[PDB]
Amino acid sequence: RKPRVLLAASGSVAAIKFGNLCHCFTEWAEVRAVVTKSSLHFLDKLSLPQEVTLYTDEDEWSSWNKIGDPVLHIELRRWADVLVIAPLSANTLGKIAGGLCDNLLTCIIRAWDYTKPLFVAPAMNTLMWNNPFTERHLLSLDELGITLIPPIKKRLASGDYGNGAMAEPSLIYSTVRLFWES
Amino acid sequence: RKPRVLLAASGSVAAIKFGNLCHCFTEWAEVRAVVTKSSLHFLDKLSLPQEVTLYTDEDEWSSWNKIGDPVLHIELRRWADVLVIAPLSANTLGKIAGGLCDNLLTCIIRAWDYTKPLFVAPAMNTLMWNNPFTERHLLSLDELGITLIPPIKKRLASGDYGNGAMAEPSLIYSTVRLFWES
Amino acid sequence: RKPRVLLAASGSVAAIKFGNLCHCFTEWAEVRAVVTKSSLHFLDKLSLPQEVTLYTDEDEWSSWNKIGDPVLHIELRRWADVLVIAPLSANTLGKIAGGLCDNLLTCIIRAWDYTKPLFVAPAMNTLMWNNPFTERHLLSLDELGITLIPPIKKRLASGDYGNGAMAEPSLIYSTVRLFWES
Ligand SMILES: Cc1cc2nc3c(=O)[nH]c(=O)nc-3n(C[C@H](O)[C@H](O)[C@H](O)COP(=O)(O)O)c2cc1C
Ligand SMILES: Cc1cc2nc3c(=O)[nH]c(=O)nc-3n(C[C@H](O)[C@H](O)[C@H](O)COP(=O)(O)O)c2cc1C
Ligand SMILES: Cc1cc2nc3c(=O)[nH]c(=O)nc-3n(C[C@H](O)[C@H](O)[C@H](O)COP(=O)(O)O)c2cc1C
Ligand SMILES: CC(C)(CO)[C@@H](O)C(=O)NCCC(=O)N/C=C\S
Ligand SMILES: CC(C)(CO)[C@@H](O)C(=O)NCCC(=O)N/C=C\S
Ligand SMILES: CC(C)(CO)[C@@H](O)C(=O)NCCC(=O)N/C=C\S
């Protein structure tokens, strides 16, 4: 009954389409959003659905004062039926592949119950995307079982035109929906 | 004559028992403590032994103004006969495995004279502990020669009950003591 | 006609010789500098050539306000014919090997067009240099095709005397020059 979907934004310029992405899921599922500090540089709070709760790192160090209180990264990991990171920056990709967790989003990933699906939609410039570490990290996510929603060939924020643009919201949406109903 | 023991705390909620941990070593050895910024969220200065000097990242960028001055992370690495990190967060674990050093504790580890013993007592939620990166990183520490003091099955700060709680101070203490006297 | 050389400084105490390093290149090439936040602890702006433009992380989040604006890390990657990091700290070395990018310098590396040469001059204490991760990371840079300019045996900022001091500016300069003219 109304699947819980955790949507997340990383520090990619593509984060400007995050509000719209949340809109694609709202009717179908109960949505909660998580963003990194850098994503707040491209994300516009008012562009998100009003029904969507936005969590930041500060929410981590606030929902807990003394033992016994809830641990947000754990609370969200449990609450969620699925996790979608769109966009996923090269930086966050590398932290995931490195087993690092220095913020709310990465802590959720580090404690992620892999029985639940986790989708990522990478977004970065072509050179960063073509860089060898990208494939290295993607290979790692595959091993973890994370599902990749490949970037498309659009007009990058850097003027040029090539691979690296984030997948379109509709595709991200249908991909997650088709899997769930399977 | 009175071994020098460097005790360290990472950003795990278990850091609340750090003062007590220092107490377990004070009589047997000369103790100096090192903590990460996040550990200061769970650590209570007044709970530590008065004879214990606490070093923070700020102490790094203070003991040095111009060439010729001492480099704290190096000064501590030399001073210490042994290093004990309890608790060791998943984040710090990953930085160690990644050869990273962006703070006092990690810089000490990065420059650690592995002729000297280094013990770690991991502390994190069960899912984070059960996460595949954990084992990956533990494997790396093993190669480096670091000694693992496994977490126990207690009642986590997240309410649930499972593996991931930090080893008890007494065990951490006896483990380090038994090795030394060998 | 006047090759574009991007010179970069990391958080090594050796960064105090960065201004002089820029001077070694100024006559031969058009120089632009990039520095990390920590490098600013050892770098003296007034010691650099006046003709040298210095870029910091803040320049990233300033040259861009809305879509369509230039992305500095990409703009610099394109502009540059070669990249030289001297000094390269153990921390930045590890971020490079980890495919991480959380600042201007690392983002440039992450998006680096490897058709262009990239040289690094590591600088760190002997123990950090002798640490096993160092070799591990150097091995990775080799695979990427990055050219290592080994550290020398001088008197470290830590008083002792051993390997780990940054290569001398003249050598860094001649190394880059000899390659270019080949
Ligand atoms: C204008 C601009 C656009 C950027 N675009 C991207 C991008 O598309 N993908 C990416 O991975 N990083 C991009 N970066 C770099 C990231 O913001 C940077 O690596 C950051 O530390 C990522 O933070 P996060 O890992 O918390 O998301 C951009 C930076 C700026 C200033
Ligand atoms: C209330 C709360 C409790 C936490 N408990 C743990 C824990 O037991 N183990 C862990 O590895 N991280 C834990 N985290 C996440 C870390 O604090 C976070 O990854 C941090 O960046 C670690 O910093 P450090 O690597 O400098 O220690 C907790 C966070 C909060 C807000
Ligand atoms: C006085 C002093 C000197 C340092 N010297 C070095 C050095 O030679 N090499 C190194 O890798 N780190 C050195 N460190 C540690 C780095 O500054 C630290 O790892 C930092 O986070 C690196 O930042 P960066 O990766 O942005 O350059 C030193 C720290 C201090 C306080
Ligand atoms: C930015 C947007 C959403 C505009 O339609 C699209 O181009 C995109 O997703 N691009 C991928 C990231 C990027 O451009 N990076 C640029 C430098 S690292
Ligand atoms: C917190 C304490 C010391 C109370 O006795 C004990 O439960 C413990 O070491 N737990 C391990 C870490 C943890 O609970 N993480 C929770 C979420 S990441
Ligand atoms: C600092 C300088 C430039 C003085 O001539 C020289 O010794 C040097 O490059 N040393 C390498 C780094 C170092 O000393 N690290 C010390 C602790 S991590």
Short mmCIF file of N, CA, C and O and ligand atoms in Angstrom, two decimals, chain A residues 60-61 64 71 73 101-102 107, chain B residues 10-13 36 38 42 89-92 95 103 123-125 128, ligand 2:
data_model
loop_
_atom_site.label_atom_id
_atom_site.label_comp_id
_atom_site.label_asym_id
_atom_site.label_seq_id
_atom_site.Cartn_x
_atom_site.Cartn_y
_atom_site.Cartn_z
N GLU A 60 20.31 14.96 10.78
CA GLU A 60 20.99 13.85 11.45
C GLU A 60 21.32 14.28 12.88
O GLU A 60 20.84 13.70 13.85
N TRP A 61 22.14 15.32 12.98
CA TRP A 61 22.58 15.85 14.27
C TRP A 61 21.54 16.72 14.93
O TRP A 61 21.85 17.78 15.47
N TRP A 64 18.82 13.51 17.26
CA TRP A 64 19.51 12.76 18.30
C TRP A 64 20.28 13.69 19.24
O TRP A 64 21.13 14.46 18.80
N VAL A 71 18.05 7.31 15.18
CA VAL A 71 19.20 7.63 14.34
C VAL A 71 18.59 7.78 12.96
O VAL A 71 18.15 6.80 12.36
N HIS A 73 19.74 8.31 9.77
CA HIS A 73 20.16 7.51 8.63
C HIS A 73 19.60 6.07 8.74
O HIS A 73 19.26 5.46 7.73
N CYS A 101 31.32 7.38 4.49
CA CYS A 101 30.04 7.93 4.91
C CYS A 101 30.29 9.12 5.81
O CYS A 101 30.51 8.98 7.02
N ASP A 102 30.26 10.30 5.22
CA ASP A 102 30.50 11.48 6.01
C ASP A 102 29.31 12.44 5.95
O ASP A 102 29.45 13.61 6.27
N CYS A 107 25.69 7.90 4.67
CA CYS A 107 25.49 7.02 5.81
C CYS A 107 24.32 6.07 5.51
O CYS A 107 24.38 4.89 5.86
N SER B 10 36.46 8.06 17.26
CA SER B 10 35.87 8.34 15.95
C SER B 10 34.41 8.67 16.20
O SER B 10 33.92 8.51 17.31
N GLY B 11 33.73 9.08 15.13
CA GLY B 11 32.35 9.48 15.15
C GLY B 11 31.26 8.45 15.39
O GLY B 11 30.20 8.51 14.78
N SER B 12 31.51 7.49 16.26
CA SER B 12 30.49 6.51 16.55
C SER B 12 29.80 6.93 17.85
O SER B 12 30.43 7.53 18.72
N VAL B 13 28.51 6.64 17.94
CA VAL B 13 27.76 6.98 19.13
C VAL B 13 28.46 6.31 20.34
O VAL B 13 28.48 6.84 21.46
N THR B 36 38.14 12.82 16.67
CA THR B 36 37.73 13.44 15.44
C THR B 36 36.63 14.46 15.77
O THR B 36 36.01 14.42 16.83
N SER B 38 33.63 14.72 14.62
CA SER B 38 32.34 14.09 14.88
C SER B 38 32.25 13.38 16.22
O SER B 38 31.18 13.27 16.82
N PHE B 42 29.58 13.01 20.72
CA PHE B 42 29.21 11.99 21.70
C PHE B 42 30.14 11.95 22.90
O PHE B 42 29.83 11.32 23.90
N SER B 89 34.73 4.39 13.63
CA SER B 89 33.49 4.51 12.84
C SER B 89 33.69 3.87 11.45
O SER B 89 34.83 3.57 11.06
N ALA B 90 32.60 3.64 10.73
CA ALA B 90 32.71 3.06 9.39
C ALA B 90 33.38 4.09 8.48
O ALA B 90 34.12 3.74 7.55
N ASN B 91 33.13 5.36 8.77
CA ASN B 91 33.73 6.39 7.96
C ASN B 91 35.27 6.38 8.12
O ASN B 91 36.01 6.37 7.14
N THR B 92 35.75 6.37 9.35
CA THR B 92 37.18 6.39 9.55
C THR B 92 37.84 5.08 9.03
O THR B 92 38.93 5.11 8.45
N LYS B 95 38.39 5.53 5.50
CA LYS B 95 39.46 6.47 5.15
C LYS B 95 40.82 5.81 5.33
O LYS B 95 41.76 6.09 4.57
N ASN B 103 42.48 14.69 8.66
CA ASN B 103 42.37 15.15 10.03
C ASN B 103 43.50 14.57 10.84
O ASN B 103 44.28 13.75 10.33
N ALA B 123 32.66 0.21 15.71
CA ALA B 123 31.35 0.45 16.30
C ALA B 123 30.47 1.10 15.25
O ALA B 123 30.80 2.15 14.70
N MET B 124 29.35 0.45 14.97
CA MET B 124 28.39 0.93 13.99
C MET B 124 27.17 0.04 14.08
O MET B 124 27.20 -1.00 14.73
N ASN B 125 26.10 0.46 13.41
CA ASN B 125 24.86 -0.29 13.35
C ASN B 125 25.14 -1.61 12.62
O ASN B 125 26.08 -1.71 11.83
N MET B 128 25.27 -1.52 8.77
CA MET B 128 26.54 -0.95 8.33
C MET B 128 27.62 -1.97 8.59
O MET B 128 28.55 -2.10 7.80
C1 LIG D 2 23.24 9.73 16.43
C2 LIG D 2 24.26 9.17 15.44
C3 LIG D 2 24.95 8.02 15.72
C4 LIG D 2 25.93 7.43 14.84
N1 LIG D 2 26.46 6.18 15.14
C5 LIG D 2 27.42 5.69 14.37
C6 LIG D 2 28.14 4.44 14.73
O1 LIG D 2 27.85 3.75 15.70
N2 LIG D 2 29.13 4.05 13.88
C7 LIG D 2 29.52 4.76 12.70
O2 LIG D 2 30.40 4.28 12.05
N3 LIG D 2 28.88 5.92 12.37
C8 LIG D 2 27.89 6.39 13.13
N4 LIG D 2 27.22 7.57 12.77
C9 LIG D 2 27.64 8.27 11.51
C10 LIG D 2 28.94 9.06 11.75
O3 LIG D 2 28.85 10.04 12.79
C11 LIG D 2 29.41 9.77 10.44
O4 LIG D 2 29.70 8.79 9.39
C12 LIG D 2 30.63 10.66 10.59
O5 LIG D 2 30.93 11.40 9.39
C13 LIG D 2 31.88 9.94 11.08
O6 LIG D 2 32.93 10.89 11.31
P1 LIG D 2 34.38 10.39 11.61
O7 LIG D 2 34.77 9.52 10.45
O8 LIG D 2 35.25 11.65 11.68
O9 LIG D 2 34.38 9.66 12.86
C14 LIG D 2 26.25 8.19 13.64
C15 LIG D 2 25.61 9.45 13.42
C16 LIG D 2 24.69 10.01 14.31
C17 LIG D 2 24.04 11.35 14.04
#
